């Protein structure tokens, strides 16, 4: 039931790499301070997402066994998980506790950022349902690692090799779920269930970006490689 010394070592190593990401407070301070036009908000999103992918590649490289994978499979895992990891991180930031009234303002500011109405509802439906899990930082870190090391990703030549790397992370997450939420034995299944909803954002990511209420949709060369844009 308890984590082994090897698992505790794995967990702290993954926590340390995960903590290298841009701080949630930095992001919410910017959105909460003042209101921006849809044009300014689009630019904030592309810079935020560019930094996210850069740090995600650094986090992915540190995942045990990742560097032993075939180079083409490495690209396929990164490309297959980038958008999902971005929405998982956004969901984590959204659910961080803030002073009274701040989360209501954050929600209203995101709702009026320039994103199409069609996508506001499924985005907030996902954020609120992630929030009901009351996940710890370790649970978000492991889930992000599990998302990256998905063997069921398209163009993966050697699935078994990816499975071998994901399995120890799934076992660590399962133990944490039993430790953090012993009254809810369904917790682990609920976290895994949320990965299916994550996959839906990846299906409509390009349309979500192109329907942003701006006249021009400019993307960084790194974003064009990761997103199906320009």
């Amino acid at each position: 039931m308890e984590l082994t010394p090897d698992q505790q070592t794995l967990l702290h190593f993954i926590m340390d790499s995960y903590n290298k990401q841009r701080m949630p407070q930095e992001i919410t301070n910017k959105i909460l301070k003042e209101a921006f036009s849809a044009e300014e908000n689009f630019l904030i999103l592309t810079e935020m997402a560019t930094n996210h992918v850069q740090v995600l590649v650094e986090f992915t490289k540190k995942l045990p066994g990742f560097q032993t994978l075939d180079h083409e499979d490495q690209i396929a895992l990164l490309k297959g998980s980038a958008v999902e990891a971005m929405f998982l991180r956004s969901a984590e930031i959204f659910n961080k506790k803030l002073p009274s009234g701040h989360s209501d303002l954050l929600e209203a500011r995101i709702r009026n950022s320039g994103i199409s109405d069609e996508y506001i509802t499924p985005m907030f439906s996902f954020y609120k349902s992630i929030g009901e899990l009351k996940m710890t930082q370790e649970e978000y870190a492991l889930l992000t690692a599990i998302v990256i090391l998905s063997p069921d990703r398209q163009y993966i030549k050697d699935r078994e090799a990816v499975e071998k790397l994901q399995e120890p992370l799934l076992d660590v997450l399962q133990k944490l779920c039993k430790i953090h939420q012993p009254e809810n034995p369904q917790h682990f299944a609920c976290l895994l269930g949320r990965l299916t909803e994550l996959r839906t954002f990846n299906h409509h990511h390009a349309e979500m970006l192109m329907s942003w209420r701006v006249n021009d949709h400019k993307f960084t060369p790194l974003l064009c490689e990761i997103w199906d844009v320009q």
């Binding site: 850069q54 490289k61 180079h71 690209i75 490309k79 060369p221 790194l222 490689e225």
Partner: peptide
């Protein structure tokens, strides 16, 4: 041809 991704991966 994910040249930038390949680059950040092989760095």
């Amino acid at each position: 041809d994910h040249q930038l991704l390949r680059y950040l991966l092989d760095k």
